[PDB]
Design a protein around this ligand. Structure first.
Ligand SMILES: OC[C@H]1O[C@@H](O)[C@H](O)[C@@H](O)[C@@H]1O
Ligand SMILES: [Ca+2]
Length: 128
């Protein structure tokens, strides 16, 4: 059921998991929770998500709590500013250290508690 887009395959899960259990599932399939590095990838993802919420590879790293990608794509704060839901990341309850795709818009991301369960998206490189 993997979907192909610009050199990568994507798995939109059918069962929900916590952020880390999701990432572990992705790793077990030679993949990672998805990074998002272009307007067209964001668009592909939120359109495919069909209005449902999916964990992506957003998580905090370092003492500063900077956002990062679990697949080790460097996180570009300037280029990604356009991708959050207005008001996010808001860090609710001081306990939202992972990120999901939530709204069907370029402005899609929300920070949510890592232990909450959601459907999730894996991203797997295609290597010819
Ligand atoms: O959905 C429950 C809550 O999750 C939080 O991450 C959001 O920032 C809030 O806007 C929302 O009410
Ligand atoms: Ca939030």
């Amino acid at each position: 059921g993997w979907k192909y887009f610009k050199g990568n395959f994507y798995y939109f899960s059918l069962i929900p998991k916590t952020w880390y259990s999701a990432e572990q599932f992705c790793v077990s399939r030679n993949s990672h929770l998805t990074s998002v590095t272009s307007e067209s990838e964001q668009e592909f993802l939120y359109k495919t998500a069909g209005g449902l919420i999916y964990w992506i590879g957003l998580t905090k790293a370092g003492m500063e709590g900077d956002w990062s990608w679990v697949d080790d794509t460097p996180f570009n704060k300037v280029q990604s500013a356009r991708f959050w839901i207005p008001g996010e990341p808001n860090n609710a309850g001081n306990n939202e250290h992972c990120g999901n795709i939530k709204a069907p818009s370029l402005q899609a991301w929300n920070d949510a508690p890592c232990d909450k369960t959601f459907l999730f998206i894996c991203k797997r490189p295609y290597v010819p």
